[PDB]
Structures are given as structure tokens and as C-alpha cells.
């Protein structure tokens, strides 16, 4: 658009018209050059500018698009900003020594390259696939991640190769032994990693999971179960105005981008007319999935899924009534493809409300529980599912009627697999999940990025450790040895914040406003992070994994806010060695900057360590991960008590029923 | 009675006729004595006798009732066994130095005692309540728990006293400062603990939570939300035959008793015709809720809710339609009252199946996720809710279609509160949640009791710790420093098993059959305990809490099986000092007995540490606790793949749809 209609809300994602305006603007600025588009996305307003606009009648922030382009024959990328109202490029630079995120188009192009490459064909034949069956060879073409033979000097993928006997097979039972290295932009194989011990393609049957396969494998499918139907005959209780949600006193903006997927902003709670801010922004900002086999070339498997592929780019169009059950409001996602044209993923986000059991209950034993009050809970769910080659990550942002917010994740999909010889032991680094199939050990780690405003600006964070009293059993201070308390360590400088979950203290963390006080308890209003799926990073200090994901070696990292501190392994993740002051390493600095009562960013590392078993193959049952942020000392009483009970009978009423 | 009709199944709880036959048998044996009934319950068959009967065409185990009685003018209790087929006492003994669980009748009787006691009246008056308002004074009459002034020589309750301005008030905003001590059997106050600092009754309004109260307090209730309706128009997929459940290949017996509440037995999975045992029995066997204020008499707050009141005794009659939503199968519970007559709690257990989101999913990026399979999960839920004076514990046993079993607990109800002076500081041992109300710190700890038979008899247990390779970064064995593995420590003797959850290793525990092997992975079939809500016991070694709950000081305790090893703080819990070799302390012994490849009992300590906040008051929002037991190396592939997908499109089908 010329200029584009500006959005309803400054945090709305770029419309398809805005995306096209941005790419036309960039094409014109680079006229006479052959360029392609890697990223065209909203450059969100500065936090100050946004808050000022929202709450102080301030300036309208300009509507800006951030782009990343490649140019034929030039190394690295160029990036910059387009001002949409004037259709001009206002910032631009060349970054010749980085590589960018891999788009779906980029994942889709590698198969034709390797199928037609003579050296790859030769390895296929050595592996036992005839030269004329190349259409049966497939690959998951990961970023090379990091290989010290090339650095960032070419843009590279590593084709993890597999074989299908029929196109409807699940290929993951038949990995091949070798790994071609592909120059993404030149479209050619530059190298093939070949193991010292060769293992030829498995001769077993594929391990398949569609109904036609299972009928052959186990005799029959189970009959259809009788349905469980879920209806909202009088509609839903939430209200959307564009991307702005209001539900059970919560209000917030639902955003979305190519990289983070869902981005929740401007989150507040309406406390009987007093609208109290909670978070300025919350999202997942990066991931790392480090594998645990030391043998070459498997050190290159440590995918930073968000930075290297994108939870937006990889997001699934969710299916009419299957992925999301019940009455659903959907949002579409819009990106640019390599030619500069907008592409849409329909039904990328689903939004709906679901039963969530009991909110609270109490009954009196005195009349045999006749005196009783029970109130049911409803939750609001904002969700997407993304597919990073083999993996499926189901992400659910959950708002609850006690004022808590939960992130739930379910891992499913398929294990990454490598070939195993008939006599080869997989342990200790993997598991034989099927004949000739080694599924290597790995971790899934996530970096949750919280930009808080607990009851307003000026916040701090703290570790909370349960501790026995230091006074011994038998002392006047602790006669019976039962005394215990919560030790709160307020983080003063960045260094103080660098903390891990500790089972020995049941560690939680507070994000609080030290400028306010709860009139009952005397404590600051807070949201408490309750999170126990917090694995140590197993890779060693100084390892490639530890270097490329500096955020992952602590459960909690707290840094001063600054604009554009979104991505903790840096802006351009693929093929960075992990050497340099960028991302979280930059933001931590020398550890000395103040983080007490200021504008802060709280980054939480959480996830699981996965030791594969046969139950996970050929397709894996959902594995749950959760964390919760809970109001503590935020309210002066339970915020849900004005919700009509499902059943309520008082002591006097019970006497009147006789 | 009598001889009563035998049950459908040896593990069925005693019917009302069996309870009556038992009490008539005992009344007759003790003819001419004045006795009352504390417990009349099934004495479950020995494990060997049961398995032999079930699987080896063995002897029918005799139908037995375990009883506990008091006799007027005699200290402690008598207990024994009645053989129901012959209406006779076959075992009997006098235990003069123990006290037994408190029943609902026992709770209910105390208020009349303290309201009419001249010394209590006097303290109420000194506290600001006129002598003629005693009908407004209430108490939660806990067991004394343990007080070294009386031991077990009298049966004693401590009346935690509160004031209500109107019968419909929630009394917990108005605790009084003193604690009467009552002889349960003599029905008299024998002492009153009076604090050095007196604190008169609060003059504030009660902190109330029924709708008529909230309308006064916040102006109005929220309007009724539009409904979410759940129906199963073609019925449910599970099938009950008496107490025996079959659902999604699982089969098990649903039992129930006065103490543990729900007991799940004889749990097996049907693996395409091969019916494989998993557990012989699983239940919650004890609890402890230790409070963290060292000031006298608050050391006496550390309720062992299961052993001292009972999760069956205290269980709520459920909804119908409110506590449990949807299509429900209910079981009733039956007990004996003090006169020997059966009592019934209707709808004590609810059984139903609910949607549980996605079971699994995978799509191929190659055709933009057109090639896709999605299967929804159903869970089966077996639940109860019990109320122990102020607390509500909602217990959900959940069976899942990937073969996992979960226990989910939600804590709600009301904080236990003590009085706080106008100028008194509650911290560090509690929180001021309302004016003049101190809610003390406490933990809620639970002992899950698992009697396993993973794929048959002969089991072991182990800790599994994730560990970096011992070889350093840069070595030939760990060049890039990423290698990691699961270290499995098999417990050989009892002492080896005494282990805590460790965040540093993401500790899980395996219960496995070392006599079998998975044909793919080479590992033993196992169920893995995945449990991270595992607080350390904060009370010190040698404390009254640590002594009375020996199980609580480790996350995991594994001991040899023997008959009647149910209750880890002993058979008769109230007023035990914690000195002596009984319960878990007895079963552990000197630590040296074998627990490798034998019949074992695996006791798991889990729960939360609760630092109250005003969000919890006057009624508390549900707080979740969970643990899971997952099949690992049990199956040779994902067990749910024969369940019909909600959506499935193969690659060939996608291409044919154009
Ligand atoms: Cu995994
Ligand atoms: Cu509690």
C-alpha cells in the first residue's frame, strides 16, 4: 500500500499489504541488484514509546518494518528498517560475516540438490541404494549449526539423509550413514562427511504409523471411541477487538512473528476498576536442542529452533476441529517469501476457552459437608503448533481465573535418528528404538523472555529459597526444630541474578515492584515464577553448545532493559561460533549493572532432558513441560470470589432444608 | 451381616452387611463390656494369596475384617481380625499405649465440651467474648499430635478456637489466642495453653466468600458465564464390572478405605492380547503437614492427615454435576460409626473420561504440512475430594493412552490461621493475610505407596541421573564437550534406595524387571517415576516432625515387601512420639536387606512448601501437585498408534487432492 493503511494497534503484525510495501521499498532502494528476502517483519516500537502512546497520550510510534536480504554474489546479509508511511529505507547495513534463519523455502530446496549431485549419488550406491532410486532419498536439511571448517563464509546446510521404500513411509527408520554439506545459496554440495565405519541402508521394514500401516502391523485399528462433545451454545465469554483480548479481567495484545511465534503484550488485570499492569511482553525468545553423542559429525546437532528456523515460519495451519477442540477463534500469520511476496499460514493461532476443573472449594465437617461452596474454573488458551523437520512443539499460553499465567508445552513428532550397525551398541549416547536405528540423547531447552511491569514500572527480581531456621533443635528460638522461612535474595546487579533451580531449597523467583506494598501482608506485589523443569546444561563450559547459547547455562538471567534485546543467541544465529560479545553475553557484560528497581528483562531457561525409549518410536507420545507465573502479594484476597459458584449452600440454608 | 454374601472380588471393600456382621461378632466376643468402634475395615488378603488366587487357580482368601475398638475405663485400644464366613474373632490384642485415628464423630463432639467448660468460658471472656455468646465460639479439634506432657496416656485433642459473628461466617479470620486440651473419651478439658502475650478477639469484619457476602464487599457478582457443555451422547468407552475397571487396555480394581481413600489394585495393560501386570497396589499411605512457627504450642501443628483423620473418613459426598463435570460413574463408601452401625458416604468416588488434548502429531514440511496425522488423547479419571477441617484435598488418579499413570492433586480450602496482634509482625514464620490474622508457613507432604509387578514378579528400583561425560572438552572421547548419558544406580540394599530428588541431575527413578529385556533397546521393562515436586523436609533431624514421619526425610524409600506394610508412620499414629522401631523405621531396619530382584515396596515423598499470601485468603485457589509413572522400555513402540486419528492424510493422498 502507498502508503499502507496503518493498523488498528501499533503492535499488530505487518499486514500482507505492509509486507509488499516494505519489499517494494527495499527492491527500489537496491534497484539493479539481484536480491532475495529472508525476513520482513514488524520492528516493534520502543518500550518507552509504546507505553507513552498507550498510557500518557504520547506520540504515535512510527510503523516500521525490519528486513533481512541476501544478494547474489555477496557474502552474508543486509538488514535494515523501512518506514512504511513514507515508503523509505531509513536504516541499512551490510553484515558479511553472519548467516540468517532458514525459511521453509530453504528447507524445501535441498532435496533436489543432493538427489542430482554425483558425489551424493555415489554414496547412496555405496550404501545400497541404486543410482536410479534417488527419488527415494530424502533429507532433513538442518543448518550446519557450526562447523569450524567454514565458519560463516558460505551459507550452509547439513542434509541428514534418509530413505523411503514408498513415499508414504516414515523415513526415520532408515537413516543413511553419511552427511552431505550444502551451500544453500549456490545450490551445490561442497563436502560429504563420511564415517570411518560404513553402514549400509537398513533392510528392515519401515516403522510406520498411519492406519493402513497399523492394520498390517497389529491386525486392526481400535474401533472409534464414542464421542465426547463440547459445545458453547450461548457463545464464549472472551471478547476480541482486533488482536486485543479481554477475558476474566485480563486484557492483552496477541501478536505473532516469524521467529518467536506468539507474542503476548501489554498484559493487565482489571482489579475492580483498577487496571493494573503485569507484563509488557512475554514470549519464547530462543531454544537449544543439544545432542549428546560425541562422535563426528553429531556435535553439529544442537538446533536453536527459534533462531535457526522460526516458530512462526514453521507453524502449522491448524485443522478445522482436530488440533483445537471446541469453539475456536483463529488468527492467520503473514510472512514474506524470497521473491518479496506475502505468504499466509491460515489458522496459525487458535484461541479458546476450556474447562479447567475446580477453582476452589470448601465445606464444613460440622453438618457433614452440607455447608459447601464449589466454583469451577475456566481457562483461556492461546496456542500454536510448529514443526521443525522431525519435531512437533505444541505451545499453549494459558490464563487462569486466579490471575495466574501458565505456559504449557507438549513435545511430539518423531525422534531424530542416525543409523546403527547390526552389532553396534547405541549406549551410552543413544537408544536402539528399532532395528538399526540409533536415537541419540538430547536436551530441549527454551528461553522464556519476560519484560515485566508488575503493577507499573520499576521492578526487581529475587530468588526465594525455603530454609530451616539456622537455630538448632533444642534452642529457645527453635525448641522442637520445626521453624522454617523463605529466604529472599534480591538481585542487585546482573551477576546476582545468574541462578539455577535448586531442589534443595525448592527455589522460586519473584518479579516484584519494590515501590509498592500489599496493605495486608506488608510485602511487594509480585508474580512468582514456579518452574521445576529446569535442566542444567549438560554440555561442558567452553563447548560449542555452551558458547552459542550463553543463556542456557543458567535457569535465570536478569538484565537491564534496552530496545531490541529480544534474541539471546544473537540476531543472526546460524553458523555463529559462539565467540563474541552479542546476545545474552553482551547484555550480561561484566555483571555489574544495576537491576534493582529499574526496567529489567528476565530470561528463564527451562525444558527437559530426553533419553529416548521405544515408546517414543516411530512417533512419540506427547511429553509435557510447564511453568507458571502466580500472583503473590499482588491482590489482597483471592481474585476469583466474585465468580458465580456452581454450588453454594450456607450453614443457615442447610438448617432450613432440615 | 452374616455369614454375609461374599463379594464379587476379594479386594472389594466391606459391604454394609459385612460391617454389621463384623461389629456384632466383636460386640459378642466382648459381651458385658462397654466398647465403641473406631475402625472396621477390610483386611486385604496377603499379596501371595491374592496373586495365587487371581493367576494360579489358588485358594480363595478368607474374607476378613480388621477392627479397632475402645473400651470405657481402659487405656488405648484393642484391635483384631474377624473371619466373616464363621462370624468369629480369630486374632485379638490390647494396645494400651497407642491412640487411633479420629473419626468425623470425634471431630464433631468437641465443640459442646469446650462451650460448656467453665475454664474455657473464662478465657473467652478474657478474650472479649461475653459468657452468654458461647454459641459463637467454634473449634477445629485436631489431634494433639504429640505433647510430651501426656504421651499416649489419654486420648487427646487440641481445640483450635475461632469466633463467628454469624453462623454463616468463615471463622478463620477470627482465631482466639488460647488452646484448650480435651480428653476425647472423658469429654472434658484437662488443660488450656495460654500465651504469655494475650491477644483479644479481632474487631474487624469477618472475611467471607459466599455470594451474599461478596455483593456487600465488591458491589456485585460477575454475571453467569456462557456455558460450556460436555456430553457423551453414545455413552462412555470404559466398562465397569463391580469395582473392576477396563479402559483403553488397562484393567484394575478400584478399592476404597477409611484411611487411604482410593486404592488401585491388580493393575495390568493388555498389550495386543498379552495381558501384562504393572502394579499390585498403589495409593497414598500417609501425609504430613508440618508448620514452621517455633512458638509454643504451634509445634503441635504437623497433621498426618491420612493416619490421624483419614482420606476415606473425611471424604466429601460429591456433586452431582458440580465437582465432577460430564458423564460420571460414582461409587459410595461405607464405614462403621462408634455404635457399630454402618455409615455411607454417597458419591464418594467419581469415575469418568475427559479430553486430554493431543496424544501425538506429525506433519511433513515438504508439502507445507499437507501430509499430516493427528490423534487426540482421552484420559480416565478416578477421584475423590476430602476435607480435613480447614483443608480440601482433591485427588485425581489419571490413566492415559500412552500407558502412563499420573496422580494429580489440587489443594484448596482455607488456611489454618492463628491470631496476630495489631503491632505484631508475622514473618518470618507466617504471613499477615488479613488484619489480625497470621497464617503460618507449612509444608504438605504425601507418601505414595507403590507395590509394583512390572511385567511380573521380581522387581528392582534405581535412580537415574543425567551426567556429562567424565572426559573433558578437547579429548578424543568428548572433542566438543557435548557428550552426556543417564547414569543408572540400581539399589541393591535398602540403604542404597534412600535418595532425594536432585535438580542438578534431573533425577528420575525406575521400577523395573531385571529378568526381562526389551528386544529393541536391550533395557529392562520399566515404569519411570517423573516427579519434581519433592521438597526436603525442613524440620531438623531429631525433631518431632522428622521422628513421627521417618519416610518424609527422603524422596524415595524402598523396602522388602511383607504383609501389612501399609502405613509408614505406623498403624496408630496420633500421640506417638516418634520414638521406636515401627512403620518405615522398622521396614528400613539396619539398611542391609536386599531389594534387588525381589518383592519390593517403593514409598515416594512428594508435595509442596506453602508460604501463604493474601491471594490464599479467605478461601484458597487450587494449587496443583503432580507426579507421573511412564512406561519406558516396557513397550517396543508407541502403544497408542492403533487409536483412530482425528485427522490423517498421507503424502500420496495429499498429491491426489491436487
Ligand atoms: Cu526429544
Ligand atoms: Cu497449605
From Swiss-Prot, chains A, B:
Q: Which residues form the signal peptide?
A: none
Q: According to its UniProt record, where is this protein located?
A: Peroxisome
Q: Where along the chain is Cu cation bound? A: 442, 444, 610
Q: Which GO terms describe its molecular function?
A: copper ion binding; primary methylamine oxidase activity; quinone binding
Q: Which residues bind Mn(2+)?
A: 451, 599-600
Required co-factor? Cu cation; Zn(2+); L-topaquinone; Mn(2+)
2',4',5'-topaquinone PTM positions: 391
One Pfam family hit: Cu_amine_oxidN2
How is this chain modified after translation?
A: Topaquinone (TPQ) is generated by copper-dependent autoxidation of a specific tyrosyl residue.
Question: Which sites carry carbohydrate?
Answer: 229
> Catalytic residues?
305 (proton acceptor), 391 (schiff-base intermediate with substrate)
Result after altering residue 305 to E: Strongly reduced activity
Q: Does the keyword Magnesium apply?
A: no
Q: List the disulfide bonds.
A: 324-350
Q: Is this entry keyworded Thylakoid?
A: no
How, per the record, is the cofactor bound? Answer: Binds 1 copper ion per subunit. Can also use zinc ion as cofactor. Contains 1 topaquinone per subunit.
Q: Name one GO biological process term.
A: amine metabolic process
Q: Domain of life of the organism in this record?
A: Eukaryota
GO cellular component annotations, sorted alphabetically?
peroxisome
User: Induction of this protein: by what?
Assistant: By methylamine.
Instruction: Tell me, in one coarse class, where this protein mainly resides.
Output: other
The record ties this protein, via PANTHER family, to: COPPER AMINE OXIDASE, COPPER AMINE OXIDASE 1-RELATED
Query: What's this protein's family per the entry?
Result: Belongs to the copper/topaquinone oxidase family.
Official protein name in the record: Peroxisomal primary amine oxidase
Q: What organism, scientifically named, is this protein from?
A: Pichia angusta
Amino acid at each position: 500500500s502507498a502508503a499502507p493503511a496503518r493498523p488498528a494497534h501499533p503492535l499488530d503484525p505487518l499486514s500482507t499489504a505492509e509486507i509488499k510495501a516494505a519489499t517494494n521499498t527495499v527492491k527500489s532502494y537496491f534497484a539493479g541488484k539481484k536480491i532475495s528476502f529472508n525476513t520482513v517483519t514488524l520492528r516493534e516500537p520502543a518500550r518507552k514509546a509504546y507505553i507513552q502512546w498507550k498510557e500518557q497520550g504520547g506520540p504515535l510510534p512510527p510503523r516500521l518494518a525490519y528486513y533481512v536480504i541476501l544478494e547474489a554474489g555477496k557474502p552474508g546479509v543486509k538488514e535494515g528498517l523501512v518506514d512504511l508511511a513514507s515508503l523509505s529505507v531509513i536504516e541499512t547495513r551490510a553484515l558479511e560475516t553472519v548467516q540468517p534463519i532458514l525459511t521453509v523455502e530453504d528447507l524445501c530446496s535441498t532435496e533436489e540438490v543432493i538427489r542430482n549431485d554425483p558425489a551424493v549419488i555415489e554414496q547412496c550406491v555405496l550404501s545400497g541404494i541404486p543410482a536410479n532410486e534417488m527419488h527415494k532419498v530424502y533429507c532433513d536439511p538442518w543448518t550446519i549449526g557450526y562447523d569450524e571448517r567454514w565458519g560463516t563464509g558460505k551459507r550452509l546446510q547439513q542434509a541428514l539423509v534418509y530413505y523411503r521404500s514408498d513415499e508414504d513411509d516414515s523415513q526415520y527408520s532408515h537413516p543413511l550413514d553419511f552427511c552431505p554439506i550444502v551451500d544453500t545459496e549456490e545450490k551445490k554440495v561442497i563436502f560429504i562427511d563420511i564415517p570411518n565405519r560404513r553402514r549400509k541402508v537398513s533392510k528392515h521394514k519401515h516403522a510406520n504409523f498411519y492406519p493402513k500401516h497399523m492394520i498390517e502391523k497389529v491386525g486392526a485399528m481400535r474401533p472409534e471411541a464414542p464421542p465426547i462433545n463440547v459445545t458453547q451454545p450461548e457463545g464464549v465469554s472472551f471478547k476480541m477487538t482486533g488482536n486485543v483480548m479481554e477475558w476474566s479481567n485480563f486484557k492483552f495484545h496477541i501478536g505473532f512473528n516469524y521467529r518467536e511465534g506468539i507474542v503476548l503484550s501489554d498484559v493487565s488485570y482489571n482489579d475492580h476498576g483498577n487496571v493494573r499492569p503485569i507484563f509488557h511482553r512475554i514470549s519464547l525468545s530462543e531454544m537449544i536442542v543439544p545432542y549428546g553423542s560425541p562422535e563426528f559429525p553429531h556435535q553439529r546437532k544442537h538446533a536453536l529452533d527459534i533462531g535457526e528456523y522460526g516458530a512462526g515460519y514453521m507453524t502449522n495451519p491448524l485443522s478445522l476441529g482436530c488440533d483445537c477442540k471446541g469453539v475456536i477463534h483463529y488468527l492467520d500469520a503473514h510472512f514474506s517469501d524470497r521473491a518479496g511476496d506475502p505468504i499466509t499460514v491460515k489458522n496459525a493461532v487458535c484461541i479458546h476457552e476450556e474447562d479447567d476443573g475446580l477453582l476452589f472449594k470448601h465445606s464444613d465437617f460440622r453438618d457433614n459437608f452440607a455447608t459447601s461452596l464449589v466454583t469451577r474454573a475456566t481457562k483461556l488458551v492461546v496456542s500454536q503448533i510448529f514443526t521443525a523437520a522431525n519435531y512437533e512443539y505444541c505451545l499453549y499460553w494459558v490464563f487462569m481465573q486466579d490471575g495466574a499465567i501458565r505456559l504449557d508445552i507438549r513435545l511430539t513428532g518423531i525422534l531424530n535418528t542416525y543409523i546403527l550397525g547390526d552389532d553396534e551398541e547405541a549406549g551410552p549416547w543413544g537408544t536402539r528404538v528399532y532395528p538399526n536405528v540409533n536415537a541419540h540423547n538430547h536436551q530441549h531447552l527454551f528461553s522464556l523472555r519476560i519484560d515485566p511491569r508488575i503493577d507499573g514500572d520499576g521492578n526487581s527480581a529475587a530468588a526465594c529459597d525455603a530454609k530451616s531456621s539456622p537455630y538448632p533443635l533444642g534452642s529457645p528460638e527453635n525448641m522442637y526444630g520445626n521453624a522454617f522461612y523463605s529466604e529472599k535474595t534480591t538481585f542487585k546487579t546482573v551477576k546476582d541474578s545468574l541462578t539455577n533451580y535448586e531442589s534443595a531449597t525448592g527455589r522460586s523467583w519473584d518479579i516484584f515492584n519494590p515501590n509498592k506494598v500489599n496493605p495486608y501482608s506488608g510485602k511487594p506485589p509480585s508474580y512468582k515464577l514456579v518452574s521445576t523443569q529446569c535442566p542444567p546444561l549438560l554440555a561442558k563450559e567452553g563447548s560449542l553448545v555452551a558458547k552459542r547459547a550463553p543463556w542456557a547455562s543458567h535457569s535465570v538471567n536478569v538484565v537491564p532493559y534496552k530496545d531490541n534485546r529480544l534474541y539471546p543467541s544473537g540476531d543472526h544465529v546460524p553458523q555463529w561460533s559462539g565467540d563474541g560479545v552479542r546476545g545474552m553475553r553482551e547484555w550480561i557484560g561484566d555483571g555489574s549493572e544495576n537491576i534493582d528497581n529499574t526496567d529489567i528483562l528476565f530470561f528463564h531457561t527451562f525444558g527437559i532432558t530426553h533419553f529416548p525409549a521405544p515408546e517414543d518410536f516411530p512417533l512419540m507420545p506427547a511429553e509435557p513441560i510447564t511453568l507458571m507465573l502466580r500472583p503473590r502479594h499482588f491482590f489482597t484476597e483471592n481474585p476469583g470470589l466474585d465468580i458465580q459458584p456452581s454450588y453454594a449452600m450456607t450453614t443457615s440454608e442447610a438448617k432450613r432444608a432440615v
